[PDB]
């Protein structure tokens, strides 16, 4: 919390603008904190980096659960419930989403950092096992199929944002589509 | 009359206007262009009364730009419809890897809701054989008045985050093009 917090804060909203790429300077002076302090909580760039994907993740997993109905089984509508959860996040927190974009995709991540993140939410990480085509779970194509889910999700919320009347039926369509592109037949 | 100071600059205000489009969004000023360009607010005006016949006029510009690089490497003896699509994506993704700036402009444009009808017709008008096509294989509703915008968003979202990773780990390109290409034929196409 507080001053770290302002660090992931201030981390969220630089990575969000300028990409993976800011600078711990900015991150820093943005926090109110200098850039010694920021060093301290966060030895590396990369640590940096792990840390706040799980805390955005964290924060994602977190919208999710608690309007999670754990009753649904079948593969389709559980992607579907986590695909509108995560549109709603993205609508309500733009730079948490543009963060989360960058991080994820970024080749920085850790063995730990995904196992970690996987397991917040066991029974979405059961389904991805389950339901996502193999070559988007395997070591090596796994980020782009992040990547892939990401930019369909970002264009939907971009026409959900600003046609908000039809957002429903957009955000019915971009999952479709996510849907075809990522899972199995 | 005295000789004229210079050329028209249409040509430089629609590259001016490519770049900031592709920096800043569609909410690029005009007053930032015309600066880029070398030229008073006022002039840009001149060529384009108005920022949304901007925007219909550098989509038609760069679309023109994407269908000639595609034209040329055609090759009409294919007739099944997923090798030919395998064709537009890999073209489209060659031209948008060469000029960056000009993929994420046609994307902004793309979207724009200020886009007419008029300029969908002509831009797809510049490409029959992609024109045909599309009608005959994307699904019908990307195909629709209603959701065409959107399907154009969809396609671009995947062709930019394919480019992306082509371009960052341009060794595996030639795979994060394939796998891009059958996740958008997914996506989007009938069976």
Redesign the interface.
């Given at each position: 919390e507080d001053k770290k917090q302002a660090l992931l804060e201030a981390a969220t909203q630089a990575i969000a603008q300028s990409g993976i790429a800011a600078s711990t300077a900015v991150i820093a002076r943005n926090a109110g904190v200098a850039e010694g302090t920021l060093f301290r909580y966060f030895a590396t760039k990369d640590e940096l980096i792990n840390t706040l994907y799980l805390h955005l993740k964290q924060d994602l997993c977190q919208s999710m659960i608690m309007e999670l109905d754990r009753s649904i089984t079948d593969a389709k509508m559980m992607t579907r419930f986590i695909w509108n959860s995560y549109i709603s996040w993205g609508l309500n927190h733009p730079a948490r989403h543009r963060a989360i974009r960058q991080l994820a995709?970024s080749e920085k991540l850790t063995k730990e950092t995904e196992q970690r993140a996987d397991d917040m939410f066991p029974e979405l990480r059961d389904l991805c096992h389950r339901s996502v085509l193999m070559?988007f779970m395997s070591d090596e194509?796994r980020?782009?199929g992040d990547?892939?889910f990401?930019?369909?999700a970002?264009?939907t919320m971009?026409?959900a944002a600003?046609d908000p009347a039809r957002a429903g039926e957009?955000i019915a369509?971009?999952f479709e589509?996510?849907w075809?592109?990522?899972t199995r037949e």
């Open positions: 995709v070559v194509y980020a782009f990547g892939l990401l930019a369909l970002e264009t971009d026409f600003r957009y369509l971009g589509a996510m075809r592109a990522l």
